[PDB]
């Protein structure tokens, strides 16, 4: 292929044309000092810290900007380059405030580290230091703008990755100021990432403000559970305390960003958390009791009952191990009526084929696509990183986004085809204009969010999408490898439950009111005590005591995602396993352990007593639940569409509106979100 | 001149390089690598089998009278196939010079005892066995020296936890100082101080 | 002198203490300042090196001239924030005099 020969410190390296000096240095292994350069963002060249010497060149060039030329010897560690770095660091530090003892970036400060390595050891600035004002930018980010290095990283992130375009550089000269000119609240589902962006602890988190230091905190790698995207996470902990949540890089999903919910709802783990088993709802006084008492009573009731009288409702943020173990328990009791709160149509192929309930195109494939058709979604406020990927495509790989939903601000420009369901049939018949855009397209995407499927017409909308997407496949030549049907999920555990074989929806409970209910981490209130008999011995396995637990006979404390190495599968089918970061609070235990102990106290006894054996049973139920960080391919959507064609329903005339019309809606959905206080401040601010 | 930079000389470096070549060519059978550091410290690496020959040569040869054994140490490097790296430091009073001899070993690979050459070794070798677990053949009396009378481990190994596995206390029931598994009120705080940026360009390992 | 506590929970003393005796947990007060909810020194683990008062950026932690504080029980030697602040208040005048005498040498 076409490559150029360049030298770094007299050593040859081949680089594709246009690669920057910084990128060639990275290739050879050297890491040039930088501040204003971010690989995800655009190039700025403002800091001038990456200045380097090209040999036999008179003037030092900026390594982050210069696209290398052939036969260039990049003298990284020349006297010229070192003195350039010295001068740049001097000017950076001249006006800085004396805040290192009182600065959240204390131990991680790149300014500190690069002054240490590539910086002088003495100051010769014998004048006064500039002073900048602070301005409330919202309830989440606190701005100490006196210590800005004016690097414009926050502005570039705001205008590119988020599209908010609220932040800017106002003024000129040393009196420059990076911030909103008016008193505005910087509120984006991706706002928090600015905190990690900015390299001089200027704009930092109000919640976490001043708690711990990097040399203290212990970091364990975990996967988010507050959204179906499964954004990889690092949980910073001290002495069992969860200090903060930080992004972990995963090119396919995270790309070094995380949602504000994901990074600021951790506080919910601290308030109103379960700790002790409880019993005695009949008398009305739900009191604490020993594991012996609670488990024995549950096992006794289970022995009394059986068949279709028992059932369970898994929902929200429950894990695959707990799901499979409860499924095994209820099946050994002879049931199969275990259900999930979320509603996915079961009229046709249902859950038998993963091609029906998955994002086949994959978030990575969202970049490759050319026309994406959004139906029944407000993707900005549900799976925000998916919207981030779409905006990335729109900005770089020019893409056309067409939406069949209420007009919302998806950050990018979208062709609001209509807010009606029969528009899908219009496209399928070819009556609509957007069909011409399809004919143009060589890689189409039709993405359908579970939000609409929750409607009463879920089967009708699913069949409409299926027929329309098959029509797209036949009319527009699409390679068999490329998948054009994909589904967006807003609940973390839905895909895992369906892969296991849980019955989607809760129609079974209402059709046959169970005598005993097993509410597993479900406080959605979909099944209230109004249904079921006058006494139904409802048992709650979960955490945070949301509100759904109260109206249950016995409460068994569980562990949140920060304390258990659960298996969580994201919307694209990939399996990711959390890592224990904090021991479960008080007496709380892991859910698979809980269910196995309950069974053994009962006559039944599950085959497994360890995480390895539970994972083996998981592999048994489905094989893709144990291939971690792997996206197993799906097919036979042809057969799915055949069954969908046979399925007979009709799309209502009700306008299709996404549940989340505003960030106020986004900021509280889960139990942890409801129990978190910072989210309350955010919602209050947005409301006013 | 540069007041804060350590003064440098090359005479000693040249002399040590000459002596390094000298020893290497005298003993090609065991010598495997000779290097003179910028600090000016001749450093010979020999095959484990050549310990007795090399040390006897350095002690007895007229042109090399390294009659005093300063240390007999071990450095643990878990990654390398031979974890333990025995270090011998010697001093020649006649020639005002110091030399270092280095060899490798393994848990299952004993090295010969040099007590015959320098009887100073005996106790250093006992410490090496006690702390790192390396065994020495033909040693007069090899036995634990710095560890407890019933200790089960080689503490200086990098795998060994700092606080160990066993703690002692008195128990009135048995009227003896009993040993129990280690439990700590405030566990050791391992601060992560490594800086993301690289510091010393010379020692940059290739990627 | 107003009454405010000098320590601003920078935690450099904790970071440097050779014996790992200092344990600090701080939170942002109502105003927004750094203040230590708990500041605990285990005086049976401390080696009285002085590296804490060496590295305290605001001269908050200081090793007073007192040397007579033998206790009758092991649990009295685990100093806490209240005990340390009371010691500082008690020895303020002499601590201040020594600091003025010495600061030039430091």
């Amino acid at each position: 292929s076409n490559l150029i020969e360049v030298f770094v410190d007299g050593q040859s390296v081949m680089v594709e044309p246009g690669t920057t000096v910084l990128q060639a240095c990275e290739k050879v292994g050297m890491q040039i000092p930088r501040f204003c350069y971010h690989e995800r963002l655009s190039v700025a060249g403002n800091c001038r810290m990456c200045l380097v010497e090209i040999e036999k060149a008179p003037k030092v060039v900026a390594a982050c900007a210069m696209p290398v030329m052939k036969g260039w010897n990049i003298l990284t560690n020349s006297e010229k380059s070192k003195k350039a770095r010295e001068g740049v660091m001097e000017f950076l530090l001249a006006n800085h405030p004396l805040d290192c003892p009182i600065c959240d970036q204390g131990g991680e400060c790149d300014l500190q580290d690069q002054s240490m390595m590539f910086g002088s050891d003495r100051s010769r600035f014998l004048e006064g230091k500039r002073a900048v004002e602070d301005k409330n930018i919202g309830p989440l980010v606190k701005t100490i703008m006196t210590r800005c290095i004016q690097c414009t990283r926050c502005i570039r992130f705001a205008s590119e990755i988020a599209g908010v375009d609220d932040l800017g550089t106002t003024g000129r000269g040393n009196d420059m100021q990076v911030g909103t000119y008016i008193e505005k609240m910087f509120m984006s589902e991706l706002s928090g990432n600015v905190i990690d962006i900015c390299p001089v602890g200027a704009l930092t988190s109000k919640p976490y403000a001043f708690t711990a230091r990097p040399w203290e905190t212990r970091k364990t790698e975990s996967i988010d559970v507050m959204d179906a995207v499964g954004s990889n996470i690092v949980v910073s902990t001290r002495t069992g305390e969860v200090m903060r949540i930080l992004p972990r890089m995963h090119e396919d999903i995270n790309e070094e960003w995380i949602s504000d919910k994901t990074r600021f709802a951790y506080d919910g783990l601290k308030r109103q958390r379960l700790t002790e088993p409880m019993v005695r709802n009949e008398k009305g006084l739900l009191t604490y009791t020993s594991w012996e008492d609670a488990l024995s009573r549950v096992a006794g009731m289970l022995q009394n009952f059986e068949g279709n009288a028992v059932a369970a409702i898994a929902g929200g943020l429950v894990d695959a191990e707990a799901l499979v173990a409860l499924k095994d328990l209820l099946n050994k009791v002879d049931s199969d009526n275990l259900c999930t709160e979320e509603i996915f149509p079961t009229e046709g192929a249902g859950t038998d084929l993963r091609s029906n309930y998955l994002l086949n195109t994959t978030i990575a494939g969202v970049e490759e696509a050319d026309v994406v058709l959004l139906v029944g979604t407000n993707p900005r406020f549900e799976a925000p990183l998916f919207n981030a990927r779409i905006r990335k495509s729109w900005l770089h790989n020019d893409l056309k986004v067409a939406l069949i939903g209420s007009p919302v601000d998806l950050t990018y420009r979208y062709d609001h085809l209509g807010d009606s369901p029969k528009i899908l049939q219009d496209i399928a018949s070819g009556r609509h204009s957007f069909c011409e855009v399809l004919k143009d397209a060589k890689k189409p995407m039709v993405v359908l969010g579970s939000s609409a499927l929750q409607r009463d017409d879920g089967a009708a909308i699913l069949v409409a999408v299926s027929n329309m997407v098959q029509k797209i496949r036949v009319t527009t030549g699409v390679a068999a490898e490329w998948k054009v049907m994909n589904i967006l999920h807003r609940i973390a555990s839905q895909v895992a439950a369906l892969d296991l074989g849980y019955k989607p929806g809760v129609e079974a409970i209402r059709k046959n009111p169970p005598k005993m209910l097993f509410l597993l981490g479900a406080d959605g209130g979909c099944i209230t005590r109004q249904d079921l008999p006058k006494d139904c011995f409802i048992v709650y396995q979960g955490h945070h005591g949301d509100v759904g637990a109260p109206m249950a006979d016995v409460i068994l404390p569980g562990a949140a995602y920060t304390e258990k190495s659960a298996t969580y599968v994201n919307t694209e089918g990939r399996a990711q396993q959390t890592k224990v970061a904090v021991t479960p609070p008080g007496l709380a235990r892991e859910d698979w352990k809980i269910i196995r102990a309950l069974s053994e106290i009962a006559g039944i006894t599950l085959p497994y007593d360890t995480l390895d054996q539970v994972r083996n049973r998981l592999e048994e139920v489905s094989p893709n639940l144990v291939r971690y960080d792997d996206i197993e391919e799906t097919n036979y959507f042809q057969q799915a569409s055949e069954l969908a064609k046979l399925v007979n329903q009709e799309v209502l005339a009700d306008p299709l509106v996404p549940p989340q019309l505003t960030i106020k809606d986004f900021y509280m959905t889960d139990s942890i979100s409801r129990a978190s206080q910072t989210m309350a401040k955010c919602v209050k601010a947005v409301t006013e | 001149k540069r007041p804060t930079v350590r003064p440098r000389s090359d005479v000693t470096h040249k002399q040590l390089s000459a002596f390094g070549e000298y020893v290497a060519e005298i003993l090609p059978k065991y010598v495997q690598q000779v290097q003179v550091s910028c600090l000016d410290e001749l450093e010979i690496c020999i095959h484990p089998d050549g310990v007795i020959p090399t040390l006897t040569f350095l002690r007895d040869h007229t042109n090399a009278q390294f009659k005093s054994l300063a240390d007999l140490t071990a450095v643990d490097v878990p990654t390398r196939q031979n974890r333990f790296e025995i270090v011998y430091n010697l001093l020649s009073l006649r020639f005002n010079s110091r030399i270092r001899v280095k060899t490798y070993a393994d848990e299952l690979t004993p090295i010969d005892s040099i007590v015959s050459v320098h009887i100073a070794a005996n106790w250093y070798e006992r410490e090496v066995w006690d702390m790192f677990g390396v065994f020495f053949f033909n040693h007069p009396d090899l036995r634990r020296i710095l560890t407890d009378y019933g200790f089960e481990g080689h503490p200086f190994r990098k795998d060994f936890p700092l606080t160990g596995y066993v703690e002692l206390r008195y128990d009135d029931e048995v009227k003896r100082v009993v040993a129990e598994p280690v439990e700590l009120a405030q566990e050791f705080r391992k601060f992560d101080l490594n800086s993301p940026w690289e510091a010393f360009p010379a020692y940059r390992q290739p990627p | 002198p107003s009454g405010e506590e000098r320590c601003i929970a920078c935690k450099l003393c904790e970071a440097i203490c050779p014996a790992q005796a200092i344990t600090i947990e701080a939170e942002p007060r109502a105003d927004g300042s750094r203040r230590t909810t708990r500041y605990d020194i285990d005086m049976t683990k401390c080696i009285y090196c002085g590296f804490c008062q060496e590295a305290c950026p605001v001269d908050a932690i200081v090793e007073g001239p007192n040397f007579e504080f033998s206790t009758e029980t092991h649990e009295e030697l685990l100093y806490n924030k209240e005990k340390l602040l009371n010691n500082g208040d008690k020895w303020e005048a002499e601590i201040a005099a020594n600091i003025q005498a010495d600061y030039l040498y430091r």
Binding site: T239, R271, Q272, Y288, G545, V582, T583 | - | -
Partner: peptide
């Protein structure tokens, strides 16, 4: 004992237990 106030006890966590309505 249980406490609505989250307590940092030595090296431990005690979250806001919250007496259940």
């Amino acid at each position: 004992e249980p406490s609505v106030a989250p307590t940092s006890t030595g090296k431990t966590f005690q979250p806001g237990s919250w007496t259940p309505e």
